[PDB]
Amino acid sequence: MKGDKKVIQHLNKILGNELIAINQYFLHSRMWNDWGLKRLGAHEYHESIDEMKHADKLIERILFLEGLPNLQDLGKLLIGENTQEMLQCDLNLELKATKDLREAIVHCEQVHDYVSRDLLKDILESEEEHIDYLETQLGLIQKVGLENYLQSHMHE
Amino acid sequence: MKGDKKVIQHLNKILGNELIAINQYFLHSRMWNDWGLKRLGAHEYHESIDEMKHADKLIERILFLEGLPNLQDLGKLLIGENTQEMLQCDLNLELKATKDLREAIVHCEQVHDYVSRDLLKDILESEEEHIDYLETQLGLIQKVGLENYLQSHMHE
Amino acid sequence: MKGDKKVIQHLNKILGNELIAINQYFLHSRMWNDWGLKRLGAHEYHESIDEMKHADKLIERILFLEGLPNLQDLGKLLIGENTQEMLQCDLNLELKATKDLREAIVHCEQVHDYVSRDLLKDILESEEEHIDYLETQLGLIQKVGLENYLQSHMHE
Amino acid sequence: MKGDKKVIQHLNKILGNELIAINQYFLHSRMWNDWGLKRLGAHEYHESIDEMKHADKLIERILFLEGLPNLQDLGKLLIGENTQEMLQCDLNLELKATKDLREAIVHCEQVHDYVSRDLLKDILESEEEHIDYLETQLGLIQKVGLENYLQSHMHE
Amino acid sequence: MKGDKKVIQHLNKILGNELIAINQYFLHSRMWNDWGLKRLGAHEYHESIDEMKHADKLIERILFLEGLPNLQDLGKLLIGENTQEMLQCDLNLELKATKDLREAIVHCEQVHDYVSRDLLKDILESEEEHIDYLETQLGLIQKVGLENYLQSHMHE
Amino acid sequence: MKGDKKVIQHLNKILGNELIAINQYFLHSRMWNDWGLKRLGAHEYHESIDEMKHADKLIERILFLEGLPNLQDLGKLLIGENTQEMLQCDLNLELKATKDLREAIVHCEQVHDYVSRDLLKDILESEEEHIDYLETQLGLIQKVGLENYLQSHMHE
Amino acid sequence: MKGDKKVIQHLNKILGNELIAINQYFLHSRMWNDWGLKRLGAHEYHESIDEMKHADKLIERILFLEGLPNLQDLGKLLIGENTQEMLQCDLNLELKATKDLREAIVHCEQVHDYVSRDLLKDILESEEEHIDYLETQLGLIQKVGLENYLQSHMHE
Ligand code: HEM
Ligand code: HEM
Ligand code: HEM
Ligand code: HEM
Ligand SMILES: O=C1NC(=O)c2c(NCc3cc(O)cc(Cl)c3)cccc21
Ligand SMILES: O=C1NC(=O)c2c(NCc3cc(O)cc(Cl)c3)cccc21
């Protein structure tokens, strides 16, 4: 079904954000695992998986709309060097992601692509859940201290 | 069954305390969940539900006694800004509650409303168990330290 | 995540409506149970529980957006004195609630808070189901007569 | 299998009748559900489903006989404005339906299309059971009164 | 264990009320069954059984306190001749019975027979549950009308 | 609940489209079954059923909004004469249907009937799935050839 | 455990190849699904997953050996425009991957990193299986014809 060119461009922009997040969250997960922080490693793995699922749906939607999904262009990974930085890099990525999501929803609405909007809204709900998680972790580091915080994420 | 007017006033006073506590504990529970202190949030949720059940039984007793239950006149919620203060706000509300319970029981006994007395005594037992919980948490904060206490309440 | 100030104000207004409904439906339920109209009492109890679940989600969303949920202010309960009046009181409350939900949705849309919009839309669907139930009961009273209507709501 | 042209015309007329009845019964069912008369709504739904199954067998038979099933021409729906009229409208439709079925069976017999006769006889048995139901409901309205009759059809 | 002479007189007074109630409710049950009001009959049967159980516990307590249970003196049965009258006779009996239970409890408290008081408090809770049932039935008769009320009690 | 008059007009137009689709898909299904293309027949049968369910929800919504569902007017069925034409006929109908759904959604949004909008969005999601199916079948005919395409749809 | 610098460079180069393959196979999978070639889509999806698992193990080895996994640099995807091209593009990528795997194994053997060699040998075995699958498909297209080949890959 011939989709709107600018909707397809927005969907590819969203997909690009997801493809960064897949790699960033996966590397962070494996870094936390390598350091023995397996509860962080496991949770971050699941966040990577969720972004893979979102990317799948974006790819399927773009193809349905007779556009070309762009898996070639990979933007900049925001990789941290310690736990606090890694969590803040994830949060910085997610805040960029939700901005792009809202702007894409605006355009979907304007051209009456209500199904694409609904997909983007569902992704937006998942990204906001991830922001909640990250902001919560950063706060917990302040409330319990970093040493306790890391201790609590050693074991699953 | 036509009840004693002052018994009904006492029951409405106890009901009004339960209505305060329902909201205060519910909000405290949600705050703790939002901060990632999910063990506190779940416990405080169960306290809120327990107060809901007491409010139900009071409403039912008042109507049996041909009174008008008063769910309109909400008193002041004691909301803290940190865990220590929230625990102390809960404890302060519970001391007011048990004082008012004792006085209502005195009056039930005087007018021979032994069934209302038995209900209030059961509520009093529940509120004293809540006081023991609160006093114990405030004591653990001293013994284990605030950061450890919070760390032990991150996960359910 | 820092939410829009007016969204949080709209969310607290919807919550304020839900807090009224919880108490109004819970009281109506227990009055119907006291009168032996147990099917009305049970249905109205589930209406109250559903408002409780809505208030929960509103509180959780307000806190995620870094607002302060307002459980202190309680508006006017519309308590009827008989079954026709109680049903009409519930319907009056619900029509005010849905007016406020639509105005809140408009504003969420304009500030691109599509997740809050989705929450409010789900609450609105539930409120329109309750309106359908209420209008149907009022119509049944006309079709079968008040004495039959009440007879049919004696047993659960 | 090339069938008799007049038989096919009869089958298309009966199909026409079933198509009216599908839509009339489905609308009546949903009106009754909207009014809170769920037992009537459910029974009328099942009547609609039964006519849908008859239309399916007529369509299949016409196609086997190398005719063109006519799903395009929809005759007049008889929609009531209250229960009493709705039942009589269904009954008026059924009486037309059975008169046409009998004339079709006569023609099937004359041209030795004994299988089409058997299909039509089975549909006729279904329509006579529907007439039995409808006559019985209208008799019950007289015996128990309209308010009782309607009361008895509120719940499933 | 030697009991207080006046407590034992109070226990025998309450026993005498239960013994009246056993027979009045049993006969009312069986009258209602004979009339085809089987839901009233079954419920009144269970009220009789509950009174039998209270009488058992009272007999048992009196004998432990080395008194003589008086099963000889049977007070006046209040036997109605129609449903509304029967319920009012049960209610009248229950109000006399709860008056006596309150007076007996006062004296147990005075002489420190706190186990006997607790037994009597349990019995009083059951009698106040029965008062609630009776008052509700009489109210229902007014709200749905006698003919409907009886109709709803033909079948279990 | 008093619906917007123009929303109700839109809902009746979408309902009108669904009623065409029910009949067209049902007839196409039974043609495919008569020709021995049972997998196409069963798939198209399920498309018809899906449209019946949409029609049901529209009828229910219209009645709730105190409008009159129009089941009397039946637009033009697009009946193909072979498999390729039948699929393209279905696709032409779906493309009209989604255009009308988008226009209906626009109006629902502008008058704040967000629940009607949500219903229509869910139907649009189902219609866009049906467009994907149809486009895919027509593309498969080109990729595997008509004879293989039909062969692959002989058996369920 | 500090690893050999060039071993790690070899591992990051194999990882780069796997990252290309992940995206190339996932896009090809979703293209085939969009075209209705669901058996090809499913198989190509599992090929993508298996490269994902290979990339995970490579990332985990690199981190253990105290190197930095490079998920930032993404080589050239070879995307076909039809089934035959897509299979050949996959095969071209696999032939490059196996050449790079052999050279890496040579180096691991020379510096005695036997565990890295064993990991790469396992990956090589999987890639040779993929080569086998791809050459076989290309051969089948010649043997059965493209239309039959595609036909056989419509349905899982
Ligand atoms: C801020 C106001 C309130 C909130 C946010 C709230 C929240 C909740 C929630 C989330 C539940 C559990 C529902 C479920 O099972 O999913 C619940 C249950 C319940 N609520 Fe409330 N509630 C409120 C006020 C009240 C009040 C005022 C009453 C009584 C007057 C009440 C009576 C009950 C009862 C009896 C239950 C059943 C609990 C059980 O037995 O499991 N609630 N409430
Ligand atoms: C009019 C006089 C009475 C009648 C007609 C009557 C009738 C009955 C009946 C029909 C049952 C059910 C037995 C069964 O089928 O298993 C029963 C149970 C019983 N009755 Fe009576 N009864 C009478 C008096 C009494 C008295 C005076 C007492 C005690 C002093 C008593 C104590 C009990 C007890 C303890 C049970 C067992 C209840 C249970 O646990 O189910 N009854 N009676
Ligand atoms: C107003 C138009 C129609 C409406 C609203 C309607 C509605 C429905 C509904 C709601 C169902 C149940 C679906 C499910 O939950 O599984 C159904 C089933 C069915 N419909 Fe219709 N329908 C319509 C017209 C037709 C027509 C014209 C035909 C055939 C010519 C038909 C044939 C069928 C059949 C065969 C079934 C399955 C019944 C069974 O065996 O259980 N419908 N319909
Ligand atoms: C275009 C980029 C990618 C897409 C679209 C994608 C998609 C998917 C999907 C749909 C799943 C299945 C999730 C589920 O339903 O359970 C999955 C699983 C997985 N992915 Fe990815 N992925 C991508 C990139 C990556 C990368 C870069 C890695 C690691 C380097 C990776 C590692 C994994 C792993 C380990 C699994 C679990 C598979 C299993 O064992 O079942 N993926 N991916
Ligand atoms: O309700 C209808 N039923 C039909 O059959 C029909 C049409 N016919 C198309 C057709 C299909 C064939 O295989 C063969 C022929 Cl000659 C015709 C057209 C409009 C409406 C209807
Ligand atoms: O397709 C149709 N849908 C309808 O509603 C309808 C009719 N309506 C009768 C009616 C029912 C009411 O409750 C109230 C009114 Cl004033 C009218 C009549 C013919 C055809 C149709």
UniProtKB/Swiss-Prot annotation, chains A, B, C, D, E, F, G:
<comment type="similarity">
    <text>Belongs to the bacterioferritin family.</text>
</comment>
<dbReference type="GO" id="GO:0006826">
    <property type="term" value="P:iron ion transport"/>
</dbReference>
<dbReference type="InterPro" id="IPR009040">
    <property type="entry name" value="Ferritin-like_diiron"/>
</dbReference>
<dbReference type="GO" id="GO:0005506">
    <property type="term" value="F:iron ion binding"/>
</dbReference>
<keyword id="KW-0813">Transport</keyword>
<feature type="binding site">
    <location>
        <position position="148"/>
    </location>
    <ligand>
        <name>K(+)</name>
    </ligand>
</feature>
<keyword id="KW-0630">Potassium</keyword>
<keyword id="KW-0479">Metal-binding</keyword>
<feature type="binding site">
    <location>
        <position position="130"/>
    </location>
    <ligand>
        <name>Fe(2+) Fe2</name>
    </ligand>
</feature>
<feature type="binding site">
    <location>
        <position position="51"/>
    </location>
    <ligand>
        <name>Fe(2+) Fe2</name>
    </ligand>
</feature>
<keyword id="KW-0349">Heme</keyword>
<feature type="binding site">
    <location>
        <position position="127"/>
    </location>
    <ligand>
        <name>Fe(2+) Fe2</name>
    </ligand>
</feature>
<dbReference type="Pfam" id="PF00210">
    <property type="entry name" value="Ferritin"/>
</dbReference>
<dbReference type="InterPro" id="IPR012347">
    <property type="entry name" value="Ferritin-like"/>
</dbReference>
<dbReference type="GO" id="GO:0005829">
    <property type="term" value="C:cytosol"/>
</dbReference>
<dbReference type="InterPro" id="IPR002024">
    <property type="entry name" value="Bacterioferritin"/>
</dbReference>
<dbReference type="GO" id="GO:0004322">
    <property type="term" value="F:ferroxidase activity"/>
</dbReference>
<keyword id="KW-0406">Ion transport</keyword>
<feature type="binding site">
    <location>
        <position position="51"/>
    </location>
    <ligand>
        <name>Fe(2+) Fe1</name>
    </ligand>
</feature>
<feature type="binding site">
    <location>
        <position position="54"/>
    </location>
    <ligand>
        <name>Fe(2+) Fe1</name>
    </ligand>
</feature>
<dbReference type="InterPro" id="IPR008331">
    <property type="entry name" value="Ferritin_DPS_dom"/>
</dbReference>
<feature type="binding site">
    <location>
        <position position="18"/>
    </location>
    <ligand>
        <name>Fe(2+) Fe1</name>
    </ligand>
</feature>
<dbReference type="GO" id="GO:0008199">
    <property type="term" value="F:ferric iron binding"/>
</dbReference>
<keyword id="KW-0963">Cytoplasm</keyword>
<dbReference type="GO" id="GO:0020037">
    <property type="term" value="F:heme binding"/>
</dbReference>
<dbReference type="GO" id="GO:0140315">
    <property type="term" value="F:iron ion sequestering activity"/>
</dbReference>
<comment type="function">
    <text>The major iron-storage protein, part of the heterooligomeric bacterioferritin (BFR) complex. The ferroxidase center binds Fe(2+), oxidizes it using dioxygen to Fe(3+), and participates in the subsequent Fe(3+) oxide mineral core formation within the central cavity of the BFR protein shell. Can store up to 600 iron atoms per bacterioferritin protein molecule.</text>
</comment>
<feature type="binding site">
    <location>
        <position position="127"/>
    </location>
    <ligand>
        <name>Fe(2+) Fe1</name>
    </ligand>
</feature>
<feature type="binding site" description="axial binding residue">
    <location>
        <position position="52"/>
    </location>
    <ligand>
        <name>heme b</name>
    </ligand>
</feature>
<protein>
    <recommendedName>
        <fullName>Bacterioferritin BfrB</fullName>
        <ecNumber>1.16.3.1</ecNumber>
    </recommendedName>
</protein>
<keyword id="KW-0409">Iron storage</keyword>
<dbReference type="GO" id="GO:0070288">
    <property type="term" value="C:ferritin complex"/>
</dbReference>
<keyword id="KW-0408">Iron</keyword>
<keyword id="KW-0410">Iron transport</keyword>
<dbReference type="GO" id="GO:0006879">
    <property type="term" value="P:intracellular iron ion homeostasis"/>
</dbReference>
<feature type="binding site">
    <location>
        <position position="151"/>
    </location>
    <ligand>
        <name>K(+)</name>
    </ligand>
</feature>
<feature type="domain" description="Ferritin-like diiron">
    <location>
        <begin position="1"/>
        <end position="145"/>
    </location>
</feature>
<dbReference type="InterPro" id="IPR009078">
    <property type="entry name" value="Ferritin-like_SF"/>
</dbReference>
<feature type="binding site">
    <location>
        <position position="94"/>
    </location>
    <ligand>
        <name>Fe(2+) Fe2</name>
    </ligand>
</feature>
<keyword id="KW-0560">Oxidoreductase</keyword>
<comment type="subunit">
    <text>The bacterioferritin (BFR) complex is formed of 24 subunits (FtnA and BfrB) arranged as 12 homodimers. The holocomplex contains about 8.7% Fe and 8.0% phosphate. A pure BfrB BFR is a hollow shell with an external diameter of 118 Angstroms and an internal diameter of 73 Angstroms that binds 12 heme molecules and up to 600 Fe(3+) ions per subunit. The BfrB-only BFR has twenty-four ferroxidase pores which serve as a conduit for Fe(2+).</text>
</comment>
